[PDB]
Write an enzyme that holds these catalytic residues in place. Structure first.
Site, short mmCIF file in Angstrom:
data_model
loop_
_atom_site.label_atom_id
_atom_site.label_comp_id
_atom_site.label_asym_id
_atom_site.label_seq_id
_atom_site.Cartn_x
_atom_site.Cartn_y
_atom_site.Cartn_z
N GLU A 58 19.49 43.50 91.53
CA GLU A 58 19.13 45.02 91.20
C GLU A 58 20.54 45.68 90.78
O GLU A 58 21.30 46.21 91.86
CB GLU A 58 18.91 45.54 92.95
CG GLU A 58 17.61 45.08 93.21
CD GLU A 58 16.43 45.40 92.46
OE1 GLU A 58 16.45 46.55 92.02
OE2 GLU A 58 15.38 44.64 92.16
N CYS A 76 20.75 54.54 91.64
CA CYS A 76 20.50 53.91 90.35
C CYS A 76 19.29 54.36 89.67
O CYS A 76 19.22 54.59 88.32
CB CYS A 76 20.22 52.47 90.83
SG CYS A 76 21.73 51.67 91.77
#
Lengths: 455, 455
Positions: free
Chosen positions: A228, A262
Site C-alpha cells: 500500500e 495517500c
C-alpha cells in the site's frame, strides 16, 4: 530513533528504547506458539468477543486515544477522533462477518466434490506509516486477528506512543499476549524478522523506498506480500459537475490531515471553460484555513508530522516553481514554532516539470488544465501512481463510465476519498498491489486449503 | 543455452539462438501496446473465440504436440497426450467462464453505492518449468489472456521446442501477436524484464533457488508475484483405508511422470500395523515398472528430463543411505544411454538424515512409520513444504477432518494428485504463495477497481 516529538511545539514528549535481539526472538516465539494454539484449538469465538471488546474500549476512551495521535504526529484532535471511530467500525465489522468470511467455499466440479477451507498461515509482519496511526494498524490487524494470524508491528519512528498503546489496547481487550506485538526495531531487524521461518507474510504501507526494501527481502525469503504505497490522485471535474456540492468537499479533499493522505486529491483536473473559476474557488477554500494548536477545536489546519516532512514539501514547492510552475496562492512561510506549511496552490505543471510526477505529501493543491474528457483521462493516467481518484459529475452514469477509464484502484464519485470496512482499498503501479479491508483484505494471508474428493 | 536433447537417446535435436536485447525491447513494447489496446477497447469476445480455437487445434494436433514434449523432456508419449487434454480443458474453461469471472462485483454498504470492476493491469512475465511443458504455460496463459494481460514467457532451457510451439499455436489460433511471446533469454535478461515498467507482475513455477531470486528482483521493483515451488507431499494411510483402492492408485501417485511432479506422493506415512504390508505392496507396484522408449505404448516408466536430473536423484538416494536410511527396493543402476533411474524405495529416514527434509524429483518412494494418526499429522507437517498431499480413508468425514489438520495447500482424498481448471492449485511455506487455476488464479493479476458513490 523512536520518540514522540509533538509537531505543534517540537517538544520531545517521550523516548522509547529499541527492542533487543533476544526480546525480538521472544516475541516471535510467543507469536508462533499462539499461532499453533489457534490452529489446534478453536478460539474463534473468543477472538470475536475480544475484537468487539477492542471496539468498546476505543469507543469509550476515544478522546484519550485521539490525543495520543495528535501528540505523536500532530493531526487535528477532531480528525483524530474520527479515525478512532473508523477503527471501532473496522473492528466490529470483522468481528461480525467472521463466521461468513471463514466459512468454507464449495467448488463446482463434475468430477466429484470439492471445497476449500480458509485457514491461518502464521505470524504476519505489518509495517505501518504515521499518517493514520490507529487506522493503519486496525486495517490489517482486525482481519488477521480473526483469521488466527498473530501479528508483529513495526510502526513509524515518529508515532511510538500510538504503536505501543495499540498493543496495550488489545491486551486490555482480553486478547492473548502475542495477538499483536509492537516492535521498536531498526530496519536491520525488520530484515531479520522477514527472514525468520516463523513469519509467513509481510503487509506494508508506506514510502516507495520502504516498500521496495521490504518487498525485496520478502521475495528473497519466499514471503507473500501486499503493498500500500503512495498516490497522486486525480480529481476530475467534468462539464456537468455540481459546483455547489463541489465547493462543499474541496477543503476535505486536499487539506484533510494537511494533505498527508495517500488518497488525497493531489491532482485537480479541470476543463478550460472552468479553469479560471476553479482557480478562484480553490483559493477561496484555501484561505479559510485556520492553522494553530491541533488540540483547539477552532483550528482547521494542522502542522505537518515532522521537520523533515515540512522541509520536503517546501523543497517540492520550490522545485515546482523553479521548473516553470506558477504560484496561484500561498507560498510564504508560517513563522511559528511547529512544522507548519500554509495551504499553497500551484498550476502550469507540464510533463517537463519533475513535480508533475511527484506526490506532494502536504497542503499543496495542483491544478491541471485540459480541454476535453479525453485529455482529462490522459493526464489522470499519465502517472506512476494509481491509488485513488475522483470524478465530479451530476450524471452518475456518466461519472461511472469515465471512472472505468482511469488506471487506478479506486474512484470516488462527487466526493473526496473515503475508507470503510466493507470497501477494498489498494492501487496499482507504484501505489502498490493487493487490497486491504473488505473481504479481499481478509484473505491476503489466508491459506485457501483445497479438499478434493474424486468420484 | 536453449536446446532440445532427447532424454532417451541423449541426442541433440534442436539448438535455438537466444533472443537479442533489441528483440526483447520490441517484444515488450508490442505487448504493452496490446495491453493498452485491450484496456481501451473491448476485445473479450475475440479472445474467447481464439482461446477456444487454441483448444480446437490442440485437440486436432494432440499427438503432434505430445511428441514435442516427449522429445523435449522425455515424458511418456501417453502422459504427454493427457497433458494436452488437460490444456484443452483449461482453455475451454476460461473461454467459457470468461464473462462470469470478469463480471462486476456489487458491495454491500449503507453509506452509498459501491462495486468494483475486474480490470487488466499489464504485461505479465511467466517463468515455467519443464515437468509439464504445456500445462505449466496454459495454467497462467489462459486465465490471463482472457482478463487482458499480454504475456511473456521464460520457459525451461531443456524444453524450448515446447515453448516455441506454444507461441506458434496461439498465433495459429488467430490471437494477435504479443498475446504470448516465448523468450529464449538469460536470467540476466529476465531480471531486466522484471525491472521494465511495462511488466506489472510475475507468476513463476519452479525451484526454490530460482524462485527466490526472481521474487527478490520482483520485490525490489514493486511487482506482484505468485510462486508455485516444490512439494514433498505426504500420502497418509489411515487405519480404515480401503487397500483395494490403495493398490489401484500407488503407481500413479509416485511414478507418474517418473516422480517429477511437485505434487507427486513423495512421503508415504503408514501405521505400524500396516507398515510391512505397505512395503510389500509398494514393492510389488514398483516392480511392474517397464522402462524404455517413451514413445513406446508399453513403456510405463520414462527417463528423467536430463543427465543432471538423474545425477541429482542418484545423489539423493546415495546420501539417504549414507545417513542411515534403509534400502527397501531397487537402487540399481540402469545401463542404457537414456537418463534412467530405476524405481527405488527407502525407509528409516530420520530428522537427522538430510533427505528427510528434501524433495526428490525422481522415481523414489519414501516410507515413514507412525504409531498413531496424530503422529501421522505431526510427520506430515514436520516439513518445509506444504503443497499437496493425500489422505486415504474409507470414512469420508474422517478423511476430511484429518486433511484439515495438515498444513498444506491441497488435500486429495483416496486418490493421488489431480489438477483441474475449476480447482485452485497452490501451497504454503517453501511451496510458495498465491494460487493458479479456478477463479482464484484468475484474479492474481487483476486490478480490483473500486467505484464508490456516497449517499
Amino acid at each position: 530513533a523512536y520518540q514522540t516529538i509533538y509537531p505543534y511545539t517540537n517538544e520531545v514528549l517521550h523516548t522509547f528504547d529499541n527492542m533487543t535481539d533476544q526480546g525480538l526472538a521472544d516475541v516471535l516465539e510467543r507469536a508462533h506458539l499462539l499461532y499453533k494454539k489457534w490452529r489446534k484449538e478453536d478460539h474463534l469465538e473468543e477472538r470475536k468477543a475480544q475484537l468487539h471488546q477492542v471496539a468498546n474500549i476505543l469507543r469509550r476512551d476515544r478522546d484519550k486515544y485521539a490525543e495520543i495521535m495528535t501528540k505523536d504526529m500532530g493531526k487535528l484532535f477532531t480528525e483524530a477522533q474520527g479515525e478512532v471511530d473508523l477503527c471501532a467500525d473496522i473492528a466490529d465489522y470483522y468481528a461480525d462477518k467472521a463466521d461468513e468470511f471463514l466459512m468454507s467455499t464449495p467448488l463446482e466440479t463434475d468430477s466429484g466434490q470439492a471445497y476449500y477451507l480458509k485457514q491461518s498461515t502464521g505470524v504476519i509482519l505489518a509495517v505501518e506509516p504515521w499518517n493514520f496511526p490507529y487506522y493503519q494498524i486496525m486495517r490489517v490487524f482486525a482481519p488477521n486477528f480473526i483469521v488466527g494470524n498473530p501479528m508483529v508491528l513495526k510502526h513509524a519512528s515518529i508515532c511510538p506512543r500510538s504503536a505501543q498503546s495499540f498493543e496495550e489496547l488489545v491486551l486490555e481487550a482480553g486478547a492473548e499476549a502475542g495477538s499483536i506485538t509492537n516492535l521498536f526495531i531498526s530496519y536491520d531487524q525488520v530484515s531479520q524478522v522477514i527472514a525468520d521461518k516463523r513469519v509467513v507474510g509481510v503487509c506494508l504501507t508506506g514510502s516507495e523506498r520502504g516498500g521496495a526494501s521490504i518487498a525485496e527481502e520478502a521475495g528473497k525469503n519466499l514471503k507473500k506480500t501486499t503493498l500500500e504505497l503512495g498516490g497522486d490522485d486525480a480529481f476530475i471535474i467534468l462539464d456537468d459537475a455540481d459546483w455547489d456540492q463541489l465547493e462543499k468537499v474541496l477543503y476535505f479533499s486536499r487539506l484533510y490531515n494537511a494533505g498527508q493522505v495517500c488518497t488525497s486529491s493531489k491532482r485537480f483536473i479541470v476543463l478550460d471553460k472552468d479553469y479560471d473559476r476553479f482557480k478562484e474557488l480553490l483559493t477561496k477554500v484555501f484561505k479559510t484555513a485556520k492553522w494553530g494548536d491541533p488540540m483547539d477545536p477552532e483550528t482547521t489546519l494542522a502542522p505537518l508530522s515532522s521537520a523533515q516532512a515540512k522541509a520536503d514539501v517546501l523543497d517540492q514547492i520550490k522545485l515546482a516553481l523553479d521548473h516553470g510552475a506558477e504560484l496561484v496562492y500561498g507560498g510564504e512561510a508560517i513563522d511559528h514554532p511547529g512544522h507548519f506549511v500554509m495551504p499553497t496552490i500551484i498550476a502550469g505543471l507540464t510533463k517537463d516539470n519533475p513535480i508533475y510526477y511527484q506526490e506532494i505529501f502536504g497542503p499543496v493543491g495542483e491544478i491541471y488544465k485540459v480541454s476535453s474528457e479525453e485529455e482529462a483521462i490522459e493526464v489522470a493516467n499519465d502517472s506512476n501512481y494509481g491509488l485513488g481518484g475522483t470524478i465530479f459529475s451530476s450524471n452518475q452514469e456518466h461519472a461511472k463510465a469515465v471512472a472505468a477509464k482511469i488506471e487506478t484502484g479506486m474512484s470516488f464519485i462527487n466526493s473526496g476519498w473515503t475508507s470503510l470496512p466493507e470497501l477494498p482499498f489498494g492501487g496499482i503501479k507504484h501505489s502498490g498491489y493487493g487490497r486491504e479491508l473488505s473481504e479481499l483484505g481478509f484473505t491476503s494471508f489466508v491459506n485457501e486449503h483445497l479438499i478434493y474428493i474424486p468420484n
